[PDB]
From Swiss-Prot, chain A:
UniProt-recorded name of the protein: 3C-like proteinase nsp5
Catalyzed reactions: TSAVLQ-|-SGFRK-NH2 and SGVTFQ-|-GKFKK the two peptides corresponding to the two self-cleavage sites of the SARS 3C-like proteinase are the two most reactive peptide substrates. The enzyme exhibits a strong preference for substrates containing Gln at P1 position and Leu at P2 position
Mutagenesis / variant outcome for changing M49A: Does not affect ability to cleave and inactivate human TRMT1
Quaternary structure, from the entry: 3CL-PRO exists as monomer and homodimer. Only the homodimer shows catalytic activity. Interacts with host FBXO22; this interaction promotes the proteasomal degradation of nsp5.
Effect of Q189A: Does not affect ability to cleave and inactivate human TRMT1
Activity regulation information from UniProt: Inhibited by pyridone-containing alpha-ketoamides compounds 13a and 13b. In turn, alpha-ketoamide 13b (tert-butyl (1-((S)-1-(((S)-4-(benzylamino)-3,4-dioxo-1-((S)-2-oxopyrrolidin-3-yl)butan-2-yl)amino)-3-cyclopropyl-1-oxopropan-2-yl)-2-oxo-1,2-dihydropyridin-3-yl)carbamate) inhibits SARS-CoV-2 replication in human lung cells. Inhibited ex vivo by michael acceptor inhibitor N3. Inhibited ex vivo by compound 11a and 11b.
Function of the protein: Cleaves the C-terminus of replicase polyprotein at 11 sites. Recognizes substrates containing the core sequence [ILMVF]-Q-|-[SGACN]. Cleaves and inactivates human TRMT1, preventing tRNA guanine(26)-dimethylation of tRNAs. May cleave human NLRP1 in lung epithelial cells, thereby activating the NLRP1 inflammasome pathway. May cleave human GSDMD, triggering alternative GSDME-mediated epithelial cell death upon activation of the NLRP1 inflammasome, which may enhance the release interleukins 1B, 6, 16 and 18. Also able to bind an ADP-ribose-1''-phosphate (ADRP).
Superkingdom, natural source: Viruses
Organism listed in the record: Severe acute respiratory syndrome coronavirus 2
Cross-link Glycyl lysine isopeptide (Lys-Gly) (interchain with G-Cter in ubiquitin) residue location(s): K5, K90
Portion held of the full protein: 3264 to 3564 of 7096
Catalytic residues, chain numbering: H41, A145
Localization per record: Host cytoplasm; Host Golgi apparatus; Host nucleus
Membrane side Cytoplasmic: residue ranges: 1-301
Domain Peptidase C30 per the UniProt entry, residue ranges: 1-301
Amino acid sequence: SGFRKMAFPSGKVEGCMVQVTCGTTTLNGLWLDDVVYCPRHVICTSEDMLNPNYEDLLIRKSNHNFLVQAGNVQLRVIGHSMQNCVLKLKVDTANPKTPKYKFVRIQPGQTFSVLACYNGSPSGVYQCAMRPNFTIKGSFLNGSAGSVGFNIDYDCVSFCYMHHMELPTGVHAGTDLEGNFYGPFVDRQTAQAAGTDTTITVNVLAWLYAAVINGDRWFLNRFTTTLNDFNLVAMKYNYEPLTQDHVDILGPLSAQTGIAVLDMCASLKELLQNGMNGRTILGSALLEDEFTPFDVVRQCS
Amino acid sequence: SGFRKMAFPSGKVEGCMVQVTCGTTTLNGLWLDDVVYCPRHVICTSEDMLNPNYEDLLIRKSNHNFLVQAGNVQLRVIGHSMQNCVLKLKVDTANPKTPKYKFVRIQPGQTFSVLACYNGSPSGVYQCAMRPNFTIKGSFLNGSAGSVGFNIDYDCVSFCYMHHMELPTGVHAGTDLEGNFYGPFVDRQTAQAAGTDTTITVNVLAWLYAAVINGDRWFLNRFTTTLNDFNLVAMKYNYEPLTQDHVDILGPLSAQTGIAVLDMCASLKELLQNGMNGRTILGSALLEDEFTPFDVVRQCSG
Ligand SMILES: CC(C)(C)NC(=O)N[C@H](C(=O)N1C[C@H]2[C@@H]([C@H]1C(=O)N[C@@H](C[C@@H]1CCNC1=O)C(=O)c1nc3ccccc3s1)C2(C)C)C(C)(C)C
Ligand SMILES: CC(C)(C)NC(=O)N[C@H](C(=O)N1C[C@H]2[C@@H]([C@H]1C(=O)N[C@@H](C[C@@H]1CCNC1=O)C(=O)c1nc3ccccc3s1)C2(C)C)C(C)(C)C
């Protein structure tokens, strides 16, 4: 038993990080088969970052302007092209450590592991969720652009995030591996703001089930409710509305604990209207929304 | 910016994990050079686990009673010996993915990463601290014994923890890689209890500095206290006393923020006496004590 913010093992991804330099600008790249993927703002000088015309900046580069280092080994760039906000560098050597992989675009509310890298070197791993406002609450310093987010299913690494930038509230924005941003953001240093965030209700319910599995039961009550009555109080507190698809996904957790989803919902409603009163759930004094139902099953079953 | 519970990248350890089976009993082992280390209770049956005489149980085994699997490959056991609560299995092949490593015994308050494994296969990675009562608040299911805890310093993996068992309060206990338990525990199924846990004061102050670095400043004030005055109120709240050694370790954080340690102690004193009053610090509504000063610098400076 117990419950932790658990990331996927990072070994398969660690062997794919390289360092990419163009001029005096350096960041991380992802090396798969014979292609290196990285954020396109590697081709920009500090001056260009204010309002770059990336097409112009790229036509003024040649293959030799890109230094790609995999540890000590230099990789020779033989082609380049830009796809949306990523650059793809064709290199002369295919990565012998390329894992089975795919590129996925995730939805708000889902979680993934981030391998934070600097100078092409893995520094740390942590778990986060895609927020409803398409930011992530990450931990990134200068030089972290190009770090990736991923999940592992069976033997296959699913890449879902490449890091680009930080917003002025301390949250982070990036793209999928096709170069398309999550959210209404652009990779230029102009005024932008994330929309208001909301709490991921289905995740909160999944975490309450993890609590019951682990013996924290003080918040349960003998009541039940309906979706419509629950969704009405949820919106009053900036919670995502619950749908029948959500109820179905919580099925296995309902089954293992014998507590129906709508009874769990009555407990949540009561916690929303009256707070915790200095009590904790799984060591937290706030309601946690960055564990999905699948995360709970994986860790508790 | 930002601040997360960050683990070390686990790749160097993943290649050392193997599955060890003796009879119907299977758990994880750690394969370094030509030695596999694993918890000695793999030699037990559901029956032996209440009052095992491990010396008796081990003399009744031979090398071929041990099946060691490294993925698709069988490793052949050519010798075995017990070192305290670990078993050391000599095998015929040296692990080609052996990293530069050392074995370290850590102190309470220090943190490390855990690679949770099942059937020799890595399942997840997370960070925890060794509590003052020598337990860890981990996440472990049946079959997780032999999972390891580690830190990475430059190129070198420092192994500090092998998982063995769960206590009835839902916390976890294990050994260093020399087989010596952390705490007063033994690997038999008899009544044992963890001592009372205390909060790691030096880590709470380190986390308060992380907050200031990230722009959370609401709890600060102009007051100052003395070490003895601070330590007076610390005891009342089950906090570890603070020593000048701790004050010294917080030096680089104090310098980078311009807030003296004794100033921040005065802020902590106030938070203990009045609570947060529905405010949060770095997204938590409780005082967090599982980040060391070193963890904060690594994550907030580089
Ligand atoms: C637009 C809006 C006002 C909302 N925000 C910003 O202007 N934020 C800016 C931003 O993040 N930028 C600026 C520049 C990069 C992107 C950027 O510096 N990435 C960072 C990761 C950042 C840093 C803090 N933690 C992170 O996540 C990064 O890794 C890099 N830096 C540079 C700079 C020069 C050369 C190469 C690189 S590689 C972009 C092309 C967008 C900062 C935080 C620097 C002010
Ligand atoms: C002594 C005290 C009363 C304070 N507590 C316990 O009796 N706790 C017991 C305990 O943990 N034991 C029993 C047995 C193992 C050790 C043990 O089962 N390890 C677990 C890891 C556990 C499980 C839950 N999460 C973990 O961490 C484990 O991986 C293994 N299981 C077995 C069983 C049979 C054969 C091989 C193995 S490999 C020991 C030799 C001590 C439990 C939780 C099973 C009741």
